[PDB]
């Protein structure tokens, strides 16, 4: 996102507001045709492209409304404040720093980090349904799961992996108990 | 393996009756061991179970995305309203004697995935099979009847 520290509202604010947000979803739910696309945002110059070098000389605020406006449940994770003011960009969504395999992990920020790595490893060899045309592919050693199931504890990103359409496991009912010593 | 790096094989399969059962007659399909949790600190694996138990009951889908404001309480308090214990526990009965378990049980659904390493593709034996040609020591590879 592109932060405009200049604003008549007396403080920094994004170049993106409800209007485009309204317009964006309008394009999606068409399925009259207008197709207000992502590129239109770049054409409007509301979101910028940044590489590693460009990151050297910017000041990225974490969550837009968390920090951009100026200035309690303890179970909420403790965060830093927006003492700084001269921002230039705000993260679109912090959860997007993960990869493809990582994103499937529910509540990864509640895990010991190497565990995340292990899941990302195994998740590659998770028996499931790899393609919907498996009946015509003559590949070697294909594996299909009898009754797949969408996970109950999904992730916002997971919808963008088509995971809900091609799940890779089942929601088993699990009881944690030293029951029979087996 | 779960979605949290708690990979593990099946130890043994118990029939439906012998499994422990709660008051509602729901026998868990899968039992893991507590000792995996404290050492590995995989708290998330617990929460997902807690969240999922709510999701199945209410009909929502657990927004388990990483960085939100969703506390444990928001799940916990939500669960309490549905008539189950706030921390996901549940009174359970042994399947053998049908006697109340002195201790409660953590319970609920959780996503589980099946992995490639089936036993039938890992077990083999050899008693005077074929040998190599160069060294006449036994060949390698279970597929080719290795040693």
């Amino acid at each position: 996102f592109i932060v405009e520290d200049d604003e008549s509202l007396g403080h920094k604010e994004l170049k993106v507001r409800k209007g485009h947000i309204a317009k964006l979803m309008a394009t999606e739910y068409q399925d009259d045709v207008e197709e207000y696309t992502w590129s239109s945002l770049l054409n409007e110059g509301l979101v910028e492209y940044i590489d590693a070098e460009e990151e050297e000389s910017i000041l990225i605020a974490m969550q837009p409304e968390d920090l951009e406006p100026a200035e309690v449940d303890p179970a909420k994770r403790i965060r830093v404040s927006h003492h700084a003011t001269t921002f230039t960009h705000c993260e679109i969504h912090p959860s997007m720093i993960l990869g493809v395999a990582a994103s499937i992990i529910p509540f990864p920020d509640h895990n010991q980090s190497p565990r995340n790595t292990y899941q990302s490893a195994m998740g590659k060899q998770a028996m499931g349904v790899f393609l919907t045309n498996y009946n015509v592919r003559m590949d070697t050693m294909a594996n299909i799961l009898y009754y797949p199931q969408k996970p109950l504890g999904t992730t916002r990103a997971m919808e963008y992996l088509k995971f809900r359409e091609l799940p890779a496991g089942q929601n088993a009912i699990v009881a944690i108990a030293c029951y029979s010593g087996y | 393996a779960s979605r949290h790096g708690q990979k593990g094989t099946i130890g043994i399969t118990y029939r439906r009756e012998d499994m422990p059962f709660t008051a509602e007659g729901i026998v868990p399909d899968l039992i893991i061991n507590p000792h995996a949790i404290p050492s590995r600190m995989t708290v998330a694996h617990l929460i997902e179970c807690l969240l999922s138990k709510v999701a199945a009951l209410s009909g929502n889908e657990g927004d388990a995305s990483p960085f939100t404001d969703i506390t444990v309480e928001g799940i916990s308090k939500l669960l309490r309203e549905h008539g189950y214990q706030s921390r996901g526990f549940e009174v359970m009965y042994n399947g053998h004697t049908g006697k109340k378990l002195m201790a409660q049980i953590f319970f609920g659904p959780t996503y589980y995935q099946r992995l490639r390493h089936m036993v039938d593709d890992k077990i083999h034996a050899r008693a005077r099979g074929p040998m190599q040609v160069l060294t006449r020591q036994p060949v390698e590879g279970r597929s080719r009847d290795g040693g």
């Binding site: 309204a22 739910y29 999904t154 | 999701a55 209410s58 929502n60 889908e61 939100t68 404001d69 928001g74």
Partner: peptide, 15 residues
Amino acid sequence: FIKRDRMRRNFLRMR
């Protein structure tokens, strides 16, 4: 605080 699906018709209301 969970996922949502039914906000779409508000756009028709907004229309």
